[PDB]
């Protein structure tokens, strides 16, 4: 674990784990180094800071500048290409999003939301975190605003799929046993036009582009739960 | 000796924070993906471990390797107890541990695979 590491040891670890040992072609690409920096920042924020809250919360760009200093081969070169790094990483981070994967009792159906447009895809009910609320309270609020359902008495803070795609972190709480006859309605959302159950085995493994990344971990989770229930 | 100091720079301190028993890094391969052979099911499974591969020796000169996982803090540190249990099959390094517990390693660069195979055999040479 990282509980006893100094901040410098953390950056040393992230440098070795993401950028120091890369093949030459990847290591000389601003773009490819940035994809490594984005994953290192995710690892730092979602794994390392969890084990040591004394470590500072860092913005993607501040993080990148600090990391470069721990990759001997790259600090000076990163300074020469500073504008390119500033440019690539600008606007890459997004406000964390939380919501839920609501399943019925049998765990065969899930609630998905969609807009009115033909081009609009289905997604799980979710939204941006506010400055005050916990990750769990954000999911409860978002699910309520988009589906009219209050999941507060059912949400389990330890059962979720937390997915990061580039700079967008999406944490969805897994909530089974939601009654199929629940009356869903969009309370204050103009962008939510349909709230419907979907049979999980009908979903592709495209109108389901946003949903597809969650399907493998969700199916593994359900499989584990079905085995544990039996 | 210069190339050995170069590969140990930073990396050794990193590995020793997690595994202080590691004495030195022998070789490195970038982007190694780990697979596991499910005996009884007779199928390979791609694990979630992918990262830098470090061939290492411990403070007792025993040879092993660490894969410093990009996907989670859970790394993989195994020993290579008998050189004959490591086989280069097609594009992969196959590592057998006595009780039919088999892992497969895919190294991004094909030249690392054949160099690491040799270095495993010679690091274990008595």
């Amino acid at each position: 674990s990282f509980t006893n590491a100094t901040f410098s040891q953390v950056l040393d670890d992230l440098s070795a784990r993401f950028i120091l040992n890369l093949p030459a072609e990847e290591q000389s690409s601003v773009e490819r180094l940035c994809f490594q920096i984005e994953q290192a920042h995710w690892f730092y924020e979602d794994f390392i800071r969890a084990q040591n809250d004394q470590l500072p919360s860092l913005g993607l760009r501040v993080f990148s500048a600090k990391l470069f200093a721990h990759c001997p081969l790259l600090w000076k070169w990163s300074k020469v290409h500073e504008e390119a790094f500033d440019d690539f990483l600008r606007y890459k981070t997004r406000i964390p999003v939380r919501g839920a994967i609501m399943l019925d009792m049998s765990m065969q159906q899930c609630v998905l939301v969609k807009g009115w447009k033909a081009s609009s895809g289905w997604g799980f009910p979710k939204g941006k975190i506010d400055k005050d609320e916990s990750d769990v309270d954000c999911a409860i609020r978002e699910v309520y605003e988009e589906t009219g359902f209050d999941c507060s008495s059912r949400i389990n803070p330890n059962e979720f799929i937390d997915m990061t795609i580039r700079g967008q972190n999406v944490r969805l709480y897994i909530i089974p046993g939601i009654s199929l006859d629940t009356r869903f309605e969009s309370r204050t959302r103009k962008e939510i036009s349909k709230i419907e159950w979907h049979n999980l085995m009908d979903l592709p493994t495209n109108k389901f582009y946003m949903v597809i990344p969650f399907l493998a971990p969700l199916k593994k989770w359900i499989k584990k739960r079905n085995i544990a229930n039996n | 000796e210069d190339e050995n100091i170069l590969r140990n720079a930073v990396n050794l301190q990193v590995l020793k924070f997690h595994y202080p028993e590691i004495e030195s890094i022998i070789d490195i391969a970038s982007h190694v993906a780990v697979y596991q052979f499910d005996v009884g099911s007779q199928k390979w499974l791609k694990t979630s471990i992918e990262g830098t591969f470090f061939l290492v020796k411990d403070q007792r000169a025993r040879v092993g390797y660490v894969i410093l996982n990009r996907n989670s803090p859970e790394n993989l540190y195994l020993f290579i107890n008998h050189p004959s249990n490591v086989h280069l099959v097609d594009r992969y390094l196959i590592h057998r541990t006595e009780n039919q517990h088999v892992v497969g390693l895919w190294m991004f660069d094909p030249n690392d695979m054949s160099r690491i195979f040799n270095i495993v055999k010679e690091s274990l040479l008595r």
């Binding site: 093949p23 994809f35 690892f43 990061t164 989770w221 | 993906a33 007779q42 099959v89 088999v102």
Partner: peptide
């Protein structure tokens, strides 16, 4: 679970490409 999805330079093959370890005996 805590998962990451992003573009990679490396493309590791699917598990089906690996050979059956016939040295098992």
């Amino acid at each position: 679970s805590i998962l990451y999805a992003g573009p990679t330079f490396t493309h590791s093959p699917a598990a089906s490409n690996l050979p059956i370890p016939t040295f098992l005996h």
